[PDB]
């Protein structure tokens, strides 16, 4: 059924593959419209909960204290909330002064190496500052990643899909937005693949209960086969992330062009079935295109867009997280008040796929070169004060697949 249209790599004729995919899946579903209507009603109950919370001024994003994570005192109710909303805010993951200190440390590292001489939001092509790497291999980050990964069912049918207690080092850039920044923001979308979610054999397995109409049996927290997903290479993320996330390096004020998410992890089911309805052109996938993130819009997903929810006010040191299937955006802002500085650090549990990238990460770290999933700029190759292999602690070594 799936073999008639699936492909482990980018199909030579994606439109033809899409057409066959639609024919095959519509046949399997039988009455996709009825299934979609029921799914819409179920998702609507969640949207209602979200609107009720907003009306009460109550928090929508689950909020947990790092203190509880560290002490191992997060309640079952709290864990349940994260599984229901697909996201979380970890308060005081790092002391506020530590987070602010890291931001200043990176700036001093840039000055020391005359960045301005060798090089309105802006992403820095820097990956190996001591602040960035120490944060990544910190006990605090390790504890949070373990906690988050364990919300997933990673063991099923006598097989462990990933090690929740060790996450690979996924070097990313730091973003800094000073007061006065004006940005159009980013439209709602999801990562971890677009067209792949329909054509990759691995995703057909992951979403088997979505595409066969047995939605009641689809669990967004089931890990099976997600570790086998390989994003297409078009003209790009090489790791499996359970959660995307970032740590605040500055306080983040309400309404100042902030991250928003649709706190309904199962919303992806609606996204996957939408292109199968009767008002979609044969060759189209509601905006999806090779080489671009999967877009979510009012045009195609009105029910989902209504649920977009901003992160609450944050203090530097807090971290925010969202399930890999969660729809997210960044609201526009004009003459931003306060700062908007963040450090991207996800949760990517060790597995065959992530170990392969870990080896590449280790090599880049040794040279100070830009990581594989990023542009080849290699600014830090001759920089001083850089974090090196000699600075790795035991957690960092495991996170790099080292002995």
From Swiss-Prot:
- Domain of life assignment: Bacteria
Q: What is this protein called?
A: Uncharacterized protein YbiU
The organism is Escherichia coli (strain K12)
